[PDB]
Motif scaffolding. Structure first.
Motif, PDB file in Angstrom:
ATOM      1  N   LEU A  20      -6.573  24.073  21.303  1.00  0.00           N
ATOM      2  CA  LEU A  20      -7.578  25.113  21.014  1.00  0.00           C
ATOM      3  C   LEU A  20      -8.119  25.686  22.319  1.00  0.00           C
ATOM      4  O   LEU A  20      -8.223  26.910  22.473  1.00  0.00           O
ATOM      5  CB  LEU A  20      -8.724  24.588  20.131  1.00  0.00           C
ATOM      6  N   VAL A  21      -8.452  24.791  23.256  1.00  0.00           N
ATOM      7  CA  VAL A  21      -9.020  25.160  24.555  1.00  0.00           C
ATOM      8  C   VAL A  21      -8.260  24.345  25.600  1.00  0.00           C
ATOM      9  O   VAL A  21      -8.368  23.117  25.604  1.00  0.00           O
ATOM     10  CB  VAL A  21     -10.517  24.762  24.649  1.00  0.00           C
ATOM     11  N   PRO A  22      -7.477  25.001  26.483  1.00  0.00           N
ATOM     12  CA  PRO A  22      -6.751  24.180  27.463  1.00  0.00           C
ATOM     13  C   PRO A  22      -7.669  23.475  28.460  1.00  0.00           C
ATOM     14  O   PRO A  22      -8.778  23.941  28.728  1.00  0.00           O
ATOM     15  CB  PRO A  22      -5.858  25.197  28.208  1.00  0.00           C
ATOM     16  N   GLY A  23      -7.201  22.349  28.998  1.00  0.00           N
ATOM     17  CA  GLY A  23      -7.853  21.748  30.155  1.00  0.00           C
ATOM     18  C   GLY A  23      -7.623  22.680  31.341  1.00  0.00           C
ATOM     19  O   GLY A  23      -6.694  23.496  31.298  1.00  0.00           O
ATOM     20  N   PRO A  24      -8.463  22.587  32.391  1.00  0.00           N
ATOM     21  CA  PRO A  24      -8.239  23.420  33.595  1.00  0.00           C
ATOM     22  C   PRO A  24      -6.828  23.204  34.157  1.00  0.00           C
ATOM     23  O   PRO A  24      -6.243  22.131  33.955  1.00  0.00           O
ATOM     24  CB  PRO A  24      -9.299  22.907  34.579  1.00  0.00           C
ATOM     25  N   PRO A  25      -6.270  24.222  34.842  1.00  0.00           N
ATOM     26  CA  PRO A  25      -4.906  24.163  35.389  1.00  0.00           C
ATOM     27  C   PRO A  25      -4.474  22.844  36.036  1.00  0.00           C
ATOM     28  O   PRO A  25      -3.365  22.371  35.768  1.00  0.00           O
ATOM     29  CB  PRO A  25      -4.903  25.310  36.413  1.00  0.00           C
ATOM     30  N   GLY A  26      -5.307  22.254  36.878  1.00  0.00           N
ATOM     31  CA  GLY A  26      -4.864  21.027  37.578  1.00  0.00           C
ATOM     32  C   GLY A  26      -4.996  19.727  36.781  1.00  0.00           C
ATOM     33  O   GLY A  26      -4.695  18.647  37.288  1.00  0.00           O
ATOM     34  N   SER A  27      -5.450  19.813  35.534  1.00  0.00           N
ATOM     35  CA  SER A  27      -5.769  18.584  34.792  1.00  0.00           C
ATOM     36  C   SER A  27      -4.509  17.863  34.324  1.00  0.00           C
ATOM     37  O   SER A  27      -3.423  18.460  34.276  1.00  0.00           O
ATOM     38  CB  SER A  27      -6.695  18.888  33.616  1.00  0.00           C
ATOM     39  N   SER A  28      -4.647  16.578  33.984  1.00  0.00           N
ATOM     40  CA  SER A  28      -3.492  15.791  33.576  1.00  0.00           C
ATOM     41  C   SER A  28      -3.774  15.011  32.293  1.00  0.00           C
ATOM     42  O   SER A  28      -4.920  14.907  31.860  1.00  0.00           O
ATOM     43  CB  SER A  28      -3.132  14.797  34.679  1.00  0.00           C
ATOM     44  N   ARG A  29      -2.711  14.453  31.733  1.00  0.00           N
ATOM     45  CA  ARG A  29      -2.779  13.635  30.524  1.00  0.00           C
ATOM     46  C   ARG A  29      -3.289  12.234  30.865  1.00  0.00           C
ATOM     47  O   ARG A  29      -3.042  11.729  31.970  1.00  0.00           O
ATOM     48  CB  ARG A  29      -1.397  13.503  29.882  1.00  0.00           C
ATOM     49  N   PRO A  30      -3.963  11.577  29.905  1.00  0.00           N
ATOM     50  CA  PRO A  30      -4.430  10.206  30.138  1.00  0.00           C
ATOM     51  C   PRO A  30      -3.261   9.251  30.034  1.00  0.00           C
ATOM     52  O   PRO A  30      -2.191   9.631  29.569  1.00  0.00           O
ATOM     53  CB  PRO A  30      -5.413   9.978  28.992  1.00  0.00           C
ATOM     54  N   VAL A  31      -3.473   8.022  30.471  1.00  0.00           N
ATOM     55  CA  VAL A  31      -2.461   6.977  30.392  1.00  0.00           C
ATOM     56  C   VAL A  31      -2.918   5.927  29.374  1.00  0.00           C
ATOM     57  O   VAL A  31      -4.097   5.529  29.374  1.00  0.00           O
ATOM     58  CB  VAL A  31      -2.304   6.330  31.792  1.00  0.00           C
ATOM     59  N   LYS A  32      -1.990   5.435  28.546  1.00  0.00           N
ATOM     60  CA  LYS A  32      -2.336   4.348  27.630  1.00  0.00           C
ATOM     61  C   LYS A  32      -2.925   3.209  28.451  1.00  0.00           C
ATOM     62  O   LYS A  32      -2.456   2.914  29.553  1.00  0.00           O
ATOM     63  CB  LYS A  32      -1.145   3.880  26.789  1.00  0.00           C
ATOM     64  N   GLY A  33      -3.977   2.590  27.922  1.00  0.00           N
ATOM     65  CA  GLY A  33      -4.692   1.544  28.650  1.00  0.00           C
ATOM     66  C   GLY A  33      -5.940   2.032  29.359  1.00  0.00           C
ATOM     67  O   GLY A  33      -6.839   1.223  29.697  1.00  0.00           O
ATOM     68  N   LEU A  60      -7.278   3.791  25.120  1.00  0.00           N
ATOM     69  CA  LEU A  60      -6.164   4.526  24.541  1.00  0.00           C
ATOM     70  C   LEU A  60      -4.928   3.646  24.294  1.00  0.00           C
ATOM     71  O   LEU A  60      -4.446   2.979  25.204  1.00  0.00           O
ATOM     72  CB  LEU A  60      -5.819   5.701  25.467  1.00  0.00           C
ATOM     73  N   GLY A  61      -4.429   3.648  23.061  1.00  0.00           N
ATOM     74  CA  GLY A  61      -3.223   2.879  22.711  1.00  0.00           C
ATOM     75  C   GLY A  61      -3.481   1.484  22.164  1.00  0.00           C
ATOM     76  O   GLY A  61      -2.540   0.803  21.780  1.00  0.00           O
ATOM     77  N   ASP A  62      -4.751   1.072  22.107  1.00  0.00           N
ATOM     78  CA  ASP A  62      -5.119  -0.279  21.635  1.00  0.00           C
ATOM     79  C   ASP A  62      -5.290  -0.396  20.117  1.00  0.00           C
ATOM     80  O   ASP A  62      -5.699  -1.463  19.623  1.00  0.00           O
ATOM     81  CB  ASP A  62      -6.397  -0.789  22.311  1.00  0.00           C
ATOM     82  N   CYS A  63      -4.992   0.678  19.381  1.00  0.00           N
ATOM     83  CA  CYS A  63      -5.093   0.666  17.918  1.00  0.00           C
ATOM     84  C   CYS A  63      -6.535   0.417  17.467  1.00  0.00           C
ATOM     85  O   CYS A  63      -6.751  -0.217  16.422  1.00  0.00           O
ATOM     86  CB  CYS A  63      -4.203  -0.409  17.281  1.00  0.00           C
ATOM     87  N   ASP A  64      -7.507   0.911  18.240  1.00  0.00           N
ATOM     88  CA  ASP A  64      -8.920   0.772  17.873  1.00  0.00           C
ATOM     89  C   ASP A  64      -9.468   2.022  17.175  1.00  0.00           C
ATOM     90  O   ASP A  64     -10.649   2.080  16.801  1.00  0.00           O
ATOM     91  CB  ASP A  64      -9.762   0.473  19.098  1.00  0.00           C
TER      92      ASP A  64
END
Length: 118
Positions: A20-33, A60-64
């Protein structure tokens, strides 16, 4: 991505995500954990809003959290607001979530990913 683009997360067409709304150009994806913080808004197909959590913090990724959220957040940039459409199997399934979410409910999730930290 651009808002008209939908990502099929699992390749079975049942869990889809758009920006819907992009992150700023330099942003990145999170990592599981990583511990992520999101603003979550959950609605039913008829548009009824059934959950809102402005500061949902989880590993992220802990099934919580529901699968729909744990599987889609890794495909967002930090700072992005996404819309996720999710088959009931990825949500609360047969049990639902009393009192507001019935059994076998597909959900629409609007998710703003705020932070991802180790």
């Amino acid at each position: 991505g651009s808002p008209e683009e939908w990502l099929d997360i699992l390749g079975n067409g049942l869990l889809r995500k758009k920006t819907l709304v992009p992150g700023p150009p330099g942003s990145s994806r999170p990592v599981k954990g990583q511990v992520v913080t999101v603003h979550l808004q959950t609605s039913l197909e008829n548009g009824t809003r059934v959950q809102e959590e402005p500061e949902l913090v989880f590993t992220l990724g802990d099934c919580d959290v529901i699968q729909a959220l744990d599987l889609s957040v890794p495909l967002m940039d930090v700072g992005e607001t996404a819309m996720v459409t999710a088959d009931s199997k990825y949500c609360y399934g047969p049990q639902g979530r009393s009192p507001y979410i019935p059994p076998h409910a597909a959900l629409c999730l609007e998710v703003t990913l705020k932070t991802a930290v180790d």
